[PDB]
Structures are given as C-alpha cells and as structure tokens.
Amino acid sequence: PIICAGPIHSNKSADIPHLLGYSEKICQIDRLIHVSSWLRNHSQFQGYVGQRGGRSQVSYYPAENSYSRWSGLLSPCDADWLGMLVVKKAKGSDMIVPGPSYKGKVFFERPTFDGYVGWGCGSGKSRTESGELCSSDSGTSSGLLPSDRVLWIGDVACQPMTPIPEETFLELKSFSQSEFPDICKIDGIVFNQCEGESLPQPFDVAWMDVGHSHKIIMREHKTKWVQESSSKDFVCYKEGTGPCSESEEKTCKTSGSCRGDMQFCKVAGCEHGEEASEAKCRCSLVHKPGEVVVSYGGMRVRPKCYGFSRMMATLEVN
Numbered sequence: 001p002i003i004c005a006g007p008i009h010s011n012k013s014a015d016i017p018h019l020l021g022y023s024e025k026i027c028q029i030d031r032l033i034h035v036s037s038w039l040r041n042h043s044q045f046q047g048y049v050g051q052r053g054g055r056s057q058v059s060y061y062p063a064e065n066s067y068s069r070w071s072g073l074l075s076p077c078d079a080d081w082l083g084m085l086v087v088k089k090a091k092g093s094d095m096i097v098p099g100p101s102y103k104g105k106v107f108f109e110r111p112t113f114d115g116y117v118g119w120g121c122g123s124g125k126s127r128t129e130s131g132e133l134c135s136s137d138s139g140t141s142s143g144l145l146p147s148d149r150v151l152w153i154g155d156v157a158c159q160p161m162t163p164i165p166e167e168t169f170l171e172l173k174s175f176s177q178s179e180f181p182d183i184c185k186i187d188g189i190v191f192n193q194c195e196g197e198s199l200p201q202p203f204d205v206a207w208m209d210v211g212h213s214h215k216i217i218m219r220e221h222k223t224k225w226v227q228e229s230s231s232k233d234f235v236c237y238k239e240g241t242g243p244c245s246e247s248e249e250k251t252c253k254t255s256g257s258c259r260g261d262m263q264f265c266k267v268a269g270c271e272h273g274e275e276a277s278e279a280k281c282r283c284s285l286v287h288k289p290g291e292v293v294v295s296y297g298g299m300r301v302r303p304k305c306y307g308f309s310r311m312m313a314t315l316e317v318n
C-alpha cells in the first residue's frame with residue numbers, strides 16, 4: 001500500500017470523487033477506487049471493488065508476480081487513473097486470454113497489443129470460470145467487494161515515458177517483426193503479412209509501450225531500473241489523515257517546507273525542528289526499483305509500460 005490502508009466502504013451508493021492531487025490519485029489507486037470507477041461507468045456496476053484489501057490484495061495472472069511486490073510500480077489501471085493510458089471497455093472483438101481464474105472476478109484487465117482492455121461486470125454479477133460471461137453471484141450483491149475479485153493479468157510496470165521519434169518506433173516495430181516472424185496478428189492487430197493463418201493462440205511475451213500506436217514485443221532485451229527521485233517518485237500523506245491535497249503536495253514538492261524521509265528532503269527540501277502543535281504534511285519515496293529503461297534493437301528506450309503479459313497471437317501456415 002503506497003499511502004492508504006485497505007478501504008472499508010459502508011455504502012455502495014458513495015460517489016467516487018475525482019481528485020487532482022498526485023497522492024490523492026495514488027490513494028484511490030491504493031483503494032482500487034479506480035477499478036470501482038472503471039466498473040461504474042462501463043458495467044453499470046454498483047459500489048466498489050477492493051474492500052478491506054485494496055490494491056495490494058488484487059489478484060494477478062500469474063500469481064507469482066514481480067512488480068506486485070513493488071507497491072509504486074504502476075499497473076495499467078493505475079496508469080489509466082493517472083491518465084497515462086486508457087484501459088478501454090471490453091468490446092466483443094477483444095480476446096479473453098485463457099489461463100487465469102476468472103470465475104468470481106468482477107474486473108479483469110489485460111494489455112492488448114494496441115492498448116489495454118478491461119472486462120467488468122454489472123452489480124450482483126461475476127465472471128464465469130471462462131471469463132466470457134458475467135453470471136449472477138450472491139457473493140457480489142453487497143456491492144462492496146474484495147480485491148481478489150479484481151484480476152490484473154501480466155507482470156506490468158507502467159511509468160512516465162521518454163517519448164521517442166516515430167522513426168525510432170518504426171525501427172523497433174520492424175526489429176520485433178524480425179524477432180517474431182512467426183506471428184501474423186496480435187489482439188486483432190496486424191503484426192506481419194501471411195495471408196495463410198491459424199486461429200488465435202495464447203502468447204506469453206515481454207513487451208513495452210513506447211507511446212505509439214502499438215507495443216513492441218521483445219524476445220531478447222535488457223532492462224535497467226534507474227532511480228530518478230522525480231516528484232512522481234514521492235507521495236505526500238498527512239499522518240493519520242490520508243493523502244495531502246493537490247496544493248499541499250505541490251507545496252511540499254516545490255517549496256521544500258513539508259517534512260519527509262531521507263531521499264525526499266535531499267531532493268525537494270524540508271525543515272525539521274519547527275512544529276508547535278498539530279502535525280504537518282509529509283512525503284515519502286514511493287517504493288519501486290525505479291524507472292525501467294529497456295535495451296532493445298540497439299536502442300535504449302524508457303517506455304510508458306513494460307510488462308510480460310499473455311496476449312492472443314495468430315500464427316502462420318506453411
């Protein structure tokens with residue numbers, strides 16, 4: 001949990017405010033408030049996901065998940081809440097991967113080749129074991145549901161990118177195709193030219209989102225987590241209260257008057273020994289290995305999202 005403990009909602013009726021503060025959105029991300037809001041607008045779902053458990057107790061496919069152990073490594077959905085990308089509503093043509101335990105799940109999200117698709121359920125519903133249907137569920141009637149009903153597939157890390165010229169991305173695009181000549185179409189998105197294809201098959205591939213019209217999938221590739229101590233590397237909470245507001249957090253990150261930990265004070269400035277009563281804002285280093293930088297096709301890329309997920313990939317016929 002980056003900031004806020006597992007949410008304990010009393011109501012399904014409660015509205016989900018949109019908060020401007022970085023920490024505020026991190027807090028909602030912590031309490032899976034963003035999935036709950038994804039569910040409300042798209043599945044006409046009633047209430048919340050992540051009850052008592054929050055984002056840490058979300059279920060991943062696979063369960064043995066690296067980046068999960070790092071609370072500030074952003075999933076596609078957190079990234080969506082942070083506006084970095086958008087997890088699009090499930091359309092009929094987006095393919096549900098086999099593998100995960102979808103039954104019970106009210107929400108599961110998957111990186112497609114072209115983006116990120118969510119499959120949500122209506123109130124009092126939950127996915128069957130296949131994931132292709134929301135069947136009725138008495139366990140979901142309360143509308144305030146546990147985190148293991150949310151499923152994030154893929155070991156995904158999302159992060160502020162360094163944009164790359166399109167010529168660079170086209171180099172990477174074709175480098176992948178020379179690495180993956182076998183594949184013809186991924187998530188309904190044409191990868192190569194084949195004419196003779198086989199029907200969609202699963203595909204465990206590492207990949208990165210470079211901010212372009214699709215991801216680049218990588219067989220061989222090097223990564224190097226580097227620490228940046230940028231302001232997004234810190235969240236700002238009020239002790240006992242929750243996250244600082246939009247202005248309070250900006251003040252801590254610009255002026256250098258709020259309290260913090262070892263690295264936050266080194267970087268943004270803080271003061272110690274003041275007080276008089278009533279405790280202050282504080283900021284702390286988000287826990288993550290850093291910003292991933294990926295060596296691939298001779299290019300050092302700092303991507304929007306890096307992950308190893310399962311997509312569906314059609315193959316050729318010889």
Ligand SMILES: *[C@@H]1O[C@H](CO)[C@@H](O[C@@H]2O[C@H](CO)[C@@H](O[C@H]3O[C@H](CO)[C@@H](O)[C@H](O)[C@@H]3O)[C@H](O)[C@H]2NC(C)=O)[C@H](O)[C@H]1NC(C)=O
Nearest residue numbers: 016017018019034035036037038039040041042080081083
């Ligand atoms: C579910 O529906 C919500 C309503 O559309 C939506 O929340 C809305 O999110 C957008 C995008 O973040 C916000 O848009 C604008 O907000 C401020 C001004 O208020 C601007 O500064 C921004 O630049 C942006 O243009 C809406 O304010 C916000 N509305 C409400 C009532 O919360 C959610 O995003 C939807 N759910 C998901 C998962 O996307």
